[PDB]
RNA sequence: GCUAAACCUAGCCCCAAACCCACUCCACCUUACUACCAAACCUUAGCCAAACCAUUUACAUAAAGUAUAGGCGAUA
RNA sequence: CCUCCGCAUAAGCCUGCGUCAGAUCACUGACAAUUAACAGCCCAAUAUCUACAAUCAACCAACAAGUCAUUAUUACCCUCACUGUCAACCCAACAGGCAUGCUCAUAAGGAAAGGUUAAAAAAAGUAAAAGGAA
RNA sequence: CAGCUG
């Protein structure tokens, strides 16, 4: 029911609330995969009763009780979340040996510069796809020049970082 | 928080802070001197002595270390005096507020000696490493219950390994335990 | 106003550094170890003024010839147009002819 | 979910199913009168009403009978000290008016010091009898 | 007039405001007289499990103790859940033991995926 | 001084990432405010 | 504003949330609210154990002579205004109540024998060790103004002074200095002032009347 | 005595040395930042100098501003 | 007392006289809002059809010759998603401009006067003997 | 032309 977007009606203006510790991702990685299903529903709900809990409480321009577990449980959701996908990769690596869930290829935009193209999915194969033999996935030779230009632009900032680098510890060995 | 943000002795989010450094100031930064991780040796709650100033000789503890600007705060020493609650009409009430150490201006103390000694970080068969003294081969150790809520597992259903490793996906798995059954063959699409 | 109110921090200079206590040695390199180096062969610095001076457009020409391949590329482009202008002053403006 | 790639779908495909979801809801007190049914919802900015229909079904139990959605635009109207300026988010309104009759309201959530006070009580303004004379001295 | 501005729904003539949306994903596809056809399939189905007898709060009591983060590799994987297998199978065709040369025949294949989270 | 007369289809029909993208000048055009460091290249 | 009630009030009027953060350090007091237990003038060798357990060097047939010189020696900081001494030698409860009024002016105190010796009456007792005295002496007082013109007390004359004088130490290097000065409420006025005061009546608003 | 005035240190410049960058998730050539349907290369020109301008006019050391070229002139 | 203005949609703008609080001829911070039926967002192929304007359309009257359409077979069964919705507003000027539908003096919208005196000169309006372009 | 008009 709707009453699971509050807490116990007992905790309405205490300031303060008793909550554990957040999930470490060790305490998970002992969790069986359906155990860590309901344990996401257990933690969902939490959140969704710390946001209402949090908006309601700029509403009545009021502090949080305890805006902490509000931390904890986007941590344990993070934890959770970690460890689930540590046993779909550890899975893929053995099943088929890829690195990415999903596939790409290194391209190279009208821009010049190196690219990690994300594939997306797409019904029709891509020889007929009218949008997207529109993409350029090609630098013409007008571009090397401005590659060129982005490529002394960096070396500038490094050489500038570098010897500022250098300055400030000129001046630690002066002070001490 | 900016760069060349100012440490103080105020908290780095506080009232007072946004009062002192507001997101706009840029302040000459202060030189602190470089101490790596493995060689701060004040920890708070270390009893100390402090070499310069006021209360020079006098044994404290330190309550708070503020890092980044190799700072300790030896309490109740070093004591300059402000007023606090200071109404319209009302002129507040007088307390010994505590200036900030260096930590060169502070030595530790044996604690079988009460001198200020030298510490160097030695290692040891049973810890890593730990301190030692210098005057004397001496481990000064590191200085320093709970009911649980309705809402806290206990720490048996926080161990209890019941994770199976098998090669199935959680999809799998939770779809084998719900019971969910799927007739429908999933179609291949282009990836492109 | 513009004269600064308090003295400034005094210029604490060591005139017993190593830098100071061992400048000029090795000037005679040549002369009393038997012409092995040039004392010109003791100077640091950019690659196309080692035991070299010109004025400024020779500087620039150096420079172009002797680094100019690797220099960036506006760098270069600056450097082109400053040989440009200092040919077009020094041999074409002055006073004495 | 939300910032997930969905997997195709085929004409005669398996059913789209989500295992653990990725986006949270918060139930907010509304601003403007509203009828006894109906609750008011911040959904995250990409889930659909149907997806807030099974939402609340699924995991919380409600049975919703409509629901209504609106985008609200936060203001891009306040600036830093650069004179550049700051976005409040947008974020997505439901209206979710819930069936069988029943009927949500929202409840009333939010229903050394010694030192101070117990010198806050021994204060002792001055007589202005005293004329400005200070009152330590036993003369 | 603005540049700065992020380019959203709420902001062309009427034709280019109908087109933007937000990120939210379609369900069904538009027919002749712009009739909205729903699919049943292209919507998420939360599985959501009973809680019933559950004994999972959400923290953690503080009298747990600390333990050290060992990341599930596939070595690990492969030795907890193939091993034993192997080792038996040996002292006594590799799609026996729980491999898959393809998945084209599968639900919830690996690469690409096709499940959701 | 009411030359500029506004519609958003003219403004990305006219100055677009789409239109500078379709001719090798205005490719140029968006690199040189990409080298320049401009936070918007385009409408 | 005028409490911490219309202040907070206020911010949450404006919107002014300010979170209560936790901090590690607090304020490391030294002194009291007040007096334990308020001793009212014309069986507390408990409060003496428990203050010989922490300091084990205590003579009380010795303090009232020290209870002296802390006093006098005090006194003799206002007339040269050296507060750094002050700060050894009266509490932090009794350093703004006996200095702040005393500021921009000139104060010229002075001690003459005593006409009775001074003697302990009570000892009371994170420990607060806590004296009072009973001081029965002659002094003498003149306190000028920021012109240097005399607005307090004719210089020469000496003048009988009783003082109950509360003494406070903290029970690792405190000591003894002077936390309080109770006056009975049957004590004499002081002396008059040398100039005339004007106490208005209440400032009427049209709407309201006097009566 | 107001308005003000002062201030060192952010950083930067020139070298040297060394060959740089770039997929958390998601989205991004359609109206970029939008989940999903039937084609690239082709002499730079001119300013300017020649006191105009019309051919012409620069883009390690040493040989050497030598041989050469050039309205045999500016110059190269 | 004005009202040659209004109210809506379009285009444009993008929270810009909502509530709470505060500083400043006498904006800052917090919170809250715009809910789809209106409007955008459409369409399975392959063939094959589409000579006779509109104008109260009746004739009559014409020329400058016109704004609107299917059939055959095949495939086809799920259904109400997404987005726009606020304001005292835009382009200019430091006067002006603005598409369309209704209302044609208003049921809607507003105020020409900070206070005084009642000089000159200037602007605008009204009145003017006799004369009537001198 | 006649007429009107600061
Ligand atoms: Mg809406
Ligand atoms: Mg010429
Ligand atoms: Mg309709
Ligand atoms: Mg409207
Ligand atoms: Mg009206
Ligand atoms: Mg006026
Ligand atoms: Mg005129
Ligand atoms: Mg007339």
Same mark, same amino acid.
């Given at each position: 029911?709707?009453?699971?977007?509050?807490?116990?009606?007992?905790?309405?203006?205490?300031?303060?609330?008793?909550?554990?510790?957040?999930?470490?991702?060790?305490?998970?990685?002992?969790?069986?995969?359906?155990?860590?299903?309901?344990?996401?529903?257990?933690?969902?709900?939490?959140?969704?009763?710390?946001?209402?809990?949090?908006?309601?409480?700029?509403?009545?321009?009021?502090?949080?009780?305890?805006?902490?577990?509000?931390?904890?449980?986007?941590?344990?959701?993070?934890?959770?979340?970690?460890?689930?996908?540590?046993?779909?990769?550890?899975?893929?690596?053995?099943?088929?040996?890829?690195?990415?869930?999903?596939?790409?290829?290194?391209?190279?935009?009208?821009?010049?510069?190196?690219?990690?193209?994300?594939?997306?999915?797409?019904?029709?194969?891509?020889?007929?796809?009218?949008?997207?033999?529109?993409?350029?996935?090609?630098?013409?030779?007008?571009?090397?020049?401005?590659?060129?230009?982005?490529?002394?632009?960096?070396?500038?900032?490094?050489?500038?970082?570098?010897?500022?680098?250098?300055?400030?510890?000129?001046?630690?060995?002066?002070?001490? | 928080?900016?760069?060349?943000?100012?440490?103080?002795?105020?908290?780095?989010?506080?009232?007072?802070?946004?009062?002192?450094?507001?997101?706009?100031?840029?302040?000459?930064?202060?030189?602190?001197?470089?101490?790596?991780?493995?060689?701060?040796?004040?920890?708070?709650?270390?009893?100390?002595?402090?070499?310069?100033?006021?209360?020079?000789?006098?044994?404290?503890?330190?309550?708070?270390?503020?890092?980044?600007?190799?700072?300790?705060?030896?309490?109740?020493?070093?004591?300059?005096?402000?007023?606090?609650?200071?109404?319209?009409?009302?002129?507040?009430?007088?307390?010994?507020?505590?200036?900030?150490?260096?930590?060169?201006?502070?030595?530790?103390?044996?604690?079988?000696?009460?001198?200020?000694?030298?510490?160097?970080?030695?290692?040891?068969?049973?810890?890593?490493?730990?301190?030692?003294?210098?005057?004397?081969?001496?481990?000064?150790?590191?200085?320093?219950?709970?009911?649980?809520?309705?809402?806290?597992?206990?720490?048996?259903?926080?161990?209890?390994?019941?994770?199976?490793?098998?090669?199935?996906?959680?999809?799998?798995?939770?779809?084998?335990?719900?019971?969910?059954?799927?007739?429908?063959?999933?179609?291949?699409?282009?990836?492109? | 106003?513009?004269?600064?109110?308090?003295?400034?921090?005094?210029?604490?200079?060591?005139?017993?550094?190593?830098?100071?206590?061992?400048?000029?040695?090795?000037?005679?390199?040549?002369?009393?170890?038997?012409?092995?180096?040039?004392?010109?062969?003791?100077?640091?610095?950019?690659?196309?003024?080692?035991?070299?001076?010109?004025?400024?457009?020779?500087?620039?020409?150096?420079?172009?010839?002797?680094?100019?391949?690797?220099?960036?590329?506006?760098?270069?482009?600056?450097?082109?147009?400053?040989?440009?202008?200092?040919?077009?002053?020094?041999?074409?403006?002055?006073?004495?002819? | 979910?939300?910032?997930?790639?969905?997997?195709?779908?085929?004409?005669?495909?398996?059913?789209?199913?989500?295992?653990?979801?990725?986006?949270?809801?918060?139930?907010?007190?509304?601003?403007?009168?509203?009828?006894?049914?109906?609750?008011?919802?911040?959904?995250?900015?990409?889930?659909?009403?149907?997806?807030?229909?099974?939402?609340?079904?699924?995991?919380?139990?409600?049975?919703?009978?409509?629901?209504?959605?609106?985008?609200?635009?936060?203001?891009?109207?306040?600036?830093?000290?650069?004179?550049?300026?700051?976005?409040?988010?947008?974020?997505?309104?439901?209206?979710?008016?819930?069936?069988?009759?029943?009927?949500?309201?929202?409840?009333?959530?939010?229903?050394?010091?010694?030192?101070?006070?117990?010198?806050?009580?021994?204060?002792?303004?001055?007589?202005?009898?005293?004329?400005?004379?200070?009152?330590?001295?036993?003369? | 007039?603005?540049?700065?501005?992020?380019?959203?729904?709420?902001?062309?003539?009427?034709?280019?405001?109908?087109?933007?949306?937000?990120?939210?994903?379609?369900?069904?596809?538009?027919?002749?007289?712009?009739?909205?056809?729903?699919?049943?399939?292209?919507? /998420? %189905?939360?599985?959501?499990?009973? =809680? #019933?007898?559950?004994? @999972?709060?959400?923290?953690?009591?503080?009298? +747990? /103790? %600390?333990?050290?983060?060992?990341? =599930? #590799?596939?070595?690990? @994987?492969?030795?907890?859940?193939?091993?034993? +297998?192997? %080792?038996?199978?040996?002292?006594?065709?590799?799609?026996?033991?729980?491999?898959?040369?393809?998945?084209?025949?599968?639900?919830?294949?690996?690469?690409?995926?096709?499940?959701?989270? | 001084?009411?030359?500029?007369?506004?519609?958003?289809?003219?403004?990305?029909?006219?100055?677009?990432?789409?239109?500078?993208?379709?001719?090798?000048?205005?490719?140029?055009?968006?690199?040189?405010?990409?080298?320049?460091?401009?936070?918007?290249?385009?409408? | 504003?005028?409490?911490?009630?219309?202040?907070?009030?206020?911010?949450?009027?404006?919107?002014?949330?300010?979170?209560?953060?936790?901090?590690?350090?607090?304020?490391?007091?030294?002194?009291?609210?007040?007096?334990?237990?308020?001793?009212?003038?014309?069986?507390?060798?408990?409060?003496?154990?428990?203050?010989?357990?922490?300091?084990?060097?205590?003579?009380?047939?010795?303090?009232?002579?020290?209870?002296?010189?802390?006093?006098?020696?005090?006194?003799?900081?206002?007339?040269?205004?050296?507060?750094?001494?002050?700060?050894?030698?009266?509490?932090?409860?009794?350093?703004?109540?006996?200095?702040?009024?005393?500021?921009?002016?000139?104060?010229?105190?002075?001690?003459?024998?005593?006409?009775?010796?001074?003697?302990?009456?009570?000892?009371?007792?994170?420990?607060?060790?806590?004296?009072?005295?009973?001081?029965?002496?002659?002094?003498?007082?003149?306190?000028?103004?920021?012109?240097?013109?005399?607005?307090?007390?004719?210089?020469?004359?000496?003048?009988?002074?009783?003082?109950?004088?509360?003494?406070?130490?903290?029970?690792?290097?405190?000591?003894?200095?002077?936390?309080?000065?109770?006056?009975?409420?049957?004590?004499?006025?002081?002396?008059?002032?040398?100039?005339?005061?004007?106490?208005?009546?209440?400032?009427?608003?049209?709407?309201?009347?006097?009566?």
């Amino acid at each position: 029911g709707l009453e699971e977007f509050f807490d116990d009606p007992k905790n309405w203006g205490q300031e303060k609330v008793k909550s554990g510790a957040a999930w470490t991702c060790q305490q998970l990685r002992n969790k069986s995969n359906e155990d860590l299903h309901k344990l996401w529903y257990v933690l969902l709900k939490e959140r969704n009763m710390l946001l209402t809990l949090e908006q309601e409480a700029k509403r009545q321009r009021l502090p949080m009780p305890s805006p902490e577990r509000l931390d904890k449980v986007v941590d344990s959701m993070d934890a959770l979340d970690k460890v689930v996908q540590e046993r779909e990769d550890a899975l893929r690596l053995l099943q088929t040996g890829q690195e990415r869930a999903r596939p790409g290829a290194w391209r190279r935009d009208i821009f010049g510069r190196i690219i990690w193209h994300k594939f997306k999915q797409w019904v029709i194969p891509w020889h007929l796809n009218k949008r997207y033999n529109r993409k350029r996935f090609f630098a013409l030779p007008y571009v090397d020049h401005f590659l060129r230009l982005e490529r002394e632009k960096r070396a500038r900032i490094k050489a500038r970082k570098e010897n500022l680098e250098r300055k400030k510890a000129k001046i630690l060995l002066k002070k001490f | 928080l900016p760069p060349h943000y100012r440490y103080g002795m105020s908290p780095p989010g506080s009232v007072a802070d946004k009062r002192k450094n507001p997101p706009w100031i840029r302040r000459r930064p202060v030189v602190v001197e470089p101490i790596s991780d493995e060689d701060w040796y004040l920890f708070c709650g270390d009893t100390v002595e402090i070499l310069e100033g006021k209360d020079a000789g006098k044994q404290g503890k330190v309550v708070q270390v503020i890092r980044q600007r190799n700072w300790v705060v030896v309490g109740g020493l070093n004591t300059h005096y402000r007023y606090i609650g200071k109404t319209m009409d009302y002129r507040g009430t007088m307390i010994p507020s505590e200036a900030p150490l260096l930590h060169r201006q502070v030595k530790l103390v044996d604690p079988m000696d009460r001198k200020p000694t030298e510490i160097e970080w030695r290692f040891t068969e049973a810890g890593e490493r730990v301190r030692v003294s210098t005057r004397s081969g001496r481990i000064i150790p590191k200085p320093e219950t709970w009911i649980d809520g309705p809402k806290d597992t206990s720490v048996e259903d926080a161990l209890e390994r019941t994770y199976v490793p098998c090669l199935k996906t959680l999809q799998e798995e939770v779809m084998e335990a719900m019971g969910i059954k799927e007739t429908r063959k999933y179609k291949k699409v282009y990836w492109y | 106003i513009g004269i600064r109110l308090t003295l400034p921090p005094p210029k604490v200079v060591d005139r017993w550094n190593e830098k100071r206590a061992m400048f000029g040695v090795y000037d005679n390199i040549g002369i009393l170890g038997n012409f092995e180096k040039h004392p010109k062969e003791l100077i640091r610095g950019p690659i196309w003024l080692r035991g070299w001076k010109g004025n400024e457009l020779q500087r620039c020409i150096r420079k172009r010839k002797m680094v100019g391949s690797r220099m960036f590329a506006d760098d270069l482009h600056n450097l082109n147009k400053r040989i440009r202008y200092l040919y077009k002053h020094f041999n074409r403006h002055g006073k004495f002819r | 979910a939300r910032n997930v790639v969905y997997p195709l779908y085929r004409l005669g495909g398996p059913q789209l199913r989500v295992f653990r979801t990725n986006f949270f809801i918060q139930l907010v007190r509304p601003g403007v009168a509203q009828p006894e049914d109906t609750v008011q919802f911040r959904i995250p900015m990409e889930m659909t009403r149907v997806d807030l229909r099974n939402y609340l079904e699924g995991i919380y139990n409600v049975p919703v009978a409509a629901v209504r959605t609106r985008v609200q635009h936060g203001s891009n109207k306040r600036r830093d000290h650069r004179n550049v300026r700051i976005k409040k988010p947008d974020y997505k309104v439901a209206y979710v008016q819930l069936a069988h009759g029943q009927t949500f309201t929202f409840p009333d959530l939010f229903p050394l010091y010694s030192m101070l006070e117990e010198e806050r009580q021994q204060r002792q303004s001055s007589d202005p009898r005293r004329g400005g004379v200070p009152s330590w001295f036993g003369l | 007039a603005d540049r700065m501005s992020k380019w959203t729904s709420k902001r062309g003539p009427r034709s280019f405001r109908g087109r933007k949306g937000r990120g939210a994903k379609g369900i069904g596809f538009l027919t002749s007289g712009w009739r909205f056809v729903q699919i049943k399939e292209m919507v /998420p %189905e939360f599985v959501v499990p009973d =809680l #019933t007898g559950f004994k @999972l709060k959400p923290y953690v009591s503080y009298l +747990a /103790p %600390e333990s050290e983060e060992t990341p =599930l #590799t596939a070595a690990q @994987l492969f030795s907890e859940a193939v091993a034993p +297998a192997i %080792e038996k199978d040996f002292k006594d065709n590799l799609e026996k033991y729980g491999f898959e040369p393809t998945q084209e025949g599968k639900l919830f294949q690996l690469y690409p995926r096709n499940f959701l989270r | 001084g009411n030359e500029y007369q506004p519609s958003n289809i003219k403004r990305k029909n006219k100055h677009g990432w789409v239109r500078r993208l379709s001719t090798p000048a205005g490719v140029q055009v968006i690199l040189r405010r990409m080298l320049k460091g401009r936070k918007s290249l385009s409408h | 504003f005028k409490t911490e009630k219309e202040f907070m009030q206020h911010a949450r009027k404006a919107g002014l949330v300010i979170p209560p953060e936790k901090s590690d350090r607090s304020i490391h007091l030294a002194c009291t609210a007040g007096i334990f237990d308020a001793y009212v003038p014309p069986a507390s060798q408990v409060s003496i154990r428990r203050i010989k357990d922490y300091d084990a060097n205590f003579k009380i047939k010795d303090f009232p002579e020290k209870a002296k010189d802390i006093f006098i020696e005090a006194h003799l900081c206002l007339n040269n205004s050296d507060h750094d001494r002050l700060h050894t030698l009266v509490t932090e409860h009794c350093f703004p109540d006996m200095t702040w009024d005393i500021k921009y002016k000139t104060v010229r105190w002075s001690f003459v024998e005593s006409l009775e010796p001074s003697h302990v009456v009570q000892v009371r007792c994170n420990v607060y060790g806590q004296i009072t005295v009973r001081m029965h002496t002659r002094q003498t007082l003149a306190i000028y103004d920021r012109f240097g013109r005399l607005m307090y007390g004719q210089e020469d004359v000496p003048k009988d002074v009783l003082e109950y004088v509360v003494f406070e130490k903290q029970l690792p290097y405190g000591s003894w200095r002077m936390h309080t000065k109770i006056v009975p409420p049957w004590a004499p006025p002081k002396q008059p002032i040398l100039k005339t005061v004007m106490i208005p009546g209440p400032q009427l608003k049209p709407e309201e009347e006097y009566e």
